[PDB]
Amino acid sequence: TINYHELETSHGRIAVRESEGEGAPLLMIHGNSSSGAIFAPQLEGEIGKKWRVIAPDLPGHGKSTDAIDPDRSYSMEGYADAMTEVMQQLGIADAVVFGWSLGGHIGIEMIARYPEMRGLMITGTPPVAREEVGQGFKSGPDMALAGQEIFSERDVESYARSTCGEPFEASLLDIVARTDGRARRIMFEKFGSGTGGNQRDIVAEAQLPIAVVNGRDGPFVELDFVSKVKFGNLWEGKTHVIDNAGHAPFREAPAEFDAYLARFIRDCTQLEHHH
Ligand code: NI
């Protein structure tokens, strides 16, 4: 069973899903206009059966309330602050973190705020300085939606299909439609303005293991660019690509994605640590 509960935080009321796994904790952070519900394959599958998988909803997303203060909360660094507060409330200082897309950018911002993080895996996330956005992301019509406040019904469907990929389910529309659109506009503006830490430098200098796993056919991430990003400690020494998967390989190719995730968790939590 999945343990659903809600936390009162300084950002608002944050919905949290937890698997019943007794093993080391894994925080999974969803993407723009998604929710932790998207991680059903991990929560309910072999990953969540072994490890304590924690999948919250960002403020303005899913079953969480809108942010008490959108100006504070709706930014990569503001979300990192919220997730850090969530983990402190849960009493967990040393989670492995998996971040999907926006969630990966949030994970990068969490490195400074959550120093006992045992590793970070990013999927759908090119670490980029603000001036590198065109290099890290592919141009297209669904990309413009990332920072667009108001979604038409058609926008909801287009965004859901491109970002979540195969298979499409009606329930995805409900998640995307709920999202506080102010969060899209503000986060995107602040990202381009460099209001938080330079993500290129952060990942270059970070000493914890960082794993990079992407679908080969995602419409958003420039994989070549990602394969050239400098990481302080790149897990298994390369960026990884899953064939026949798009932006969301954790749902499009769960077995192959879970192989990477499980191995990364094992590596970050069950090997003898030496500096
Ligand atoms: Ni979706």
Residue numbers in the entry: 2 to 276
Which sentences from the paper describe this structure?
N-Acyl homoserine lactonases (AHL-lactonases) have important functions in decreasing pathogenicity by degrading AHLs.
The biochemical data demonstrate that the Glu219→Gly mutation weakens the His-dependent solvent-assisted deprotonation and thus decreases the activity of AidH. Throughout the reaction, the carboxyl group of Glu219 forms a hydrogen bond to His248, giving it the correct conformation and the proper tautomeric equilibrium after it accepts the proton from Ser102.
